[PDB]
Amino acid sequence: DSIIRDLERENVGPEFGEFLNTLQTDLNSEKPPIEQVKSQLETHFNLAHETQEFSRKNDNAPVDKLLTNYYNNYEVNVLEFVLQMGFSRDLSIPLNVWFVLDMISQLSTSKQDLPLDYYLVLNNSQTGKYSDFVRYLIYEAVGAEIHLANRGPIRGNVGAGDRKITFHLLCKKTARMILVGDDRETDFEMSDRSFVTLLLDYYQRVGTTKKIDLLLLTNNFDTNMNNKLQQLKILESLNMLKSNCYVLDYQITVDQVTANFNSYVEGIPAFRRHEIANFLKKRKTPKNADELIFKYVGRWNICYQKKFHQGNISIHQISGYLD
Amino acid sequence: RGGAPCAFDRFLATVQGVDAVRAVLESTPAIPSPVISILENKIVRQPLV
């Protein structure tokens, strides 16, 4: 409810607020809470046509069960460190949320799974406002009536296989709280550029050296900073992706960013190398020089392999590292 | 009355000064006009009245 108040403020419509009172999971029933909150979303917000179009416009791609499709019981359930680099500009906030929830759904079929760690990054003004609505939905989905906080990861058991989960929502509100020692007054500006680097600052402070094994990349808002290629490149740079990390890029809209991402991931080493250098001569200026894009440039020597493709939705895996 | 402030005063004025700005922002007519004070080494907002 506290969330509903901050929502009405951030120009968010009544829809979302209302939902957080019609939201109730049955702790008794055979059908898991994640599936219960999953259906309640499609029911209240009517994601029936939008999901159909999200499939149709992507060559009837099973947007529905993207992981279940390519991976097998073992491969899917083995993935334990997931980083979802934003929400897609092409889909609504609920469809994005629904997708997030559905990813976890696929990742937790078995009961013989080592604990899951899912990180969701809400990197722009448009999505950040829904982080607390997202955490409340997750608190239900995972059923954290096991034993919510303003800041912090949500822990619980999730999916058909009651898999141990720890959901981390990384956003600007959490970043502003952190910096000011959780002081009441957080009303100061923070740019999405500043944000990417404080994330990197937290990872470097937190002692995190467990590698990402599933990278969800999409058509984030504020392309200038939140660029997919630039996102991939930085993770490549920092030794953050597992040797056999899977990379899923998903969207409807096809643009120059998409072609470039596709040409880098899918490109021969000479190609990759020249791209890194061409960008560097073209985009680096003495003012620009300090940006994270000029320090964390990518590694042309990382090799990928196409594992799945259906027009605009693709899975590639890291195949090897040339040295 | 003259000279550079001592170590404690440098801390006291800087910290109470930041809180004074916060107290301005954190205001509404319902919340009374404060005096930024110090009590058990803790900055407190006492009422001016």
**Taking the mean position of all CA atoms in its chain, how far away is CA A138?**
14
- Report the distance separating Cα A95 and Cα A91, nearest Å: 6
**Nearest alpha carbon to residue A246 among A90, A107, A58:** A107
Contact A200, A292 (CB under 8 A): yes
* Chain B interface mutation, best of A179, A185, A186, highest count of B Cβ atoms under 10 Å: A185
Residues of chain A with Cβ-Cβ distance to B22 below 8 Å are: 183-185
Question: In sequence order, which residues have a C-beta less than 8 Å from that of residue A144 and are 6 or more positions away?
Answer: A154, A155, A156
Which residue of chain B is at minimal alpha-carbon distance from A185? B22
The string of DSSP letters for A18-63 reads HHHHH----SSSSS-HHHHHHHHHHHHH-HHHHHHHHHHTTTS--G
- Report the alpha-carbon distance of residue A46 to residue A238 in Å, rounded: 40
* Cα pseudo-dihedral A233, A238, A243, A249, rounded to 10: -30
Q: List Cα–Cα distances, A276 to A162, A172, A265, A290, in angstroms.
A: 44, 29, 12, 16
DSSP assignment, residue A288? G
Å resolution of this model? 3.0
Query: What is the helix (H) or strand (E) element at residue A112, kind and residue range?
Result: none
Neighbours of A194 (CB within 10 A): 12
* B45 labeled binding residue: no
DSSP for A232-285? HHHHHHTT-EEEEEEEEEE-S---HHHHHHHHHHTS-HHHHHHHHHHHHHHH--
Q: Are B26 and A183 a contacting pair at CB < 8 A?
A: no
* Domain locations in chain A as residue ranges: 1-323
- Buried residues in B1-28 as b, exposed as e (16+ CB within 10 A): eeeeeeeeeeeeeeebeebeebbeeeee
Distance CA A90, CA A294 (A): 29
Q: How far apart are CA A246 and CA A235, in angstroms?
A: 13
Q: How many CB atoms lie within 10 A of CB B34?
A: 18
Q: Would you give the DSSP letter of residue A151? A: S
Picking from A17, A1, A291, A9, the residue whose alpha carbon sits closest to that of residue A173 is A9
Domain A1-323 of CATH type 3.60.110.10: no
Question: Is A251 exposed, middle or buried, given 0-12, 13-18 or 19+ CB atoms closer than 10 A?
Answer: buried
Residue B22's closest chain A neighbor by CA? A185
Experimental approach was X-ray
DSSP state of A65: G
- Report the b/e string of A15-43 with b at 16+ CB within 10 A: ebbebbeebebeeeeeebbbbbbbebbee
Q: Which CA distances in Å does B33 have to A186, A187, B46?
A: 21, 21, 8
Of the candidates A251, A180, A190, A264, the residue with the CA atom closest to the CA atom of residue A225 = A190
Q: Return the biggest CA–CA distance within chain A.
A: 62
Q: Which sign does the torsion angle of CA A219, A224, A229, A233 carry? A: negative
Give the Å distances, CA to CA, from A243 to A68, A125, A200, A314: 22, 33, 20, 19
Taking the CA of residue A185 and the nearest CA in chain B, the distance in Å comes to 7
What b-and-e string marks burial along A132-148, b requiring 16 or more CB atoms within 10 Å of the CB? Answer: bbbbbbbbbbbbbeeee
Between the CA of residue A161 and those of A30, A115, A123, A213, A219, what are the distances in Å? Answer: 11, 11, 31, 20, 31
> Which letter does DSSP use for residue A111 in this model?
S
Residue A170 has which token pair? 């990384």
> Under a CB-based contact definition with an 8 Å cutoff, are residues A124 and A192 in contact?
yes
SS3 at position B26: coil
- Tell me whether A290 touches chain B (CB under 8 Å): no
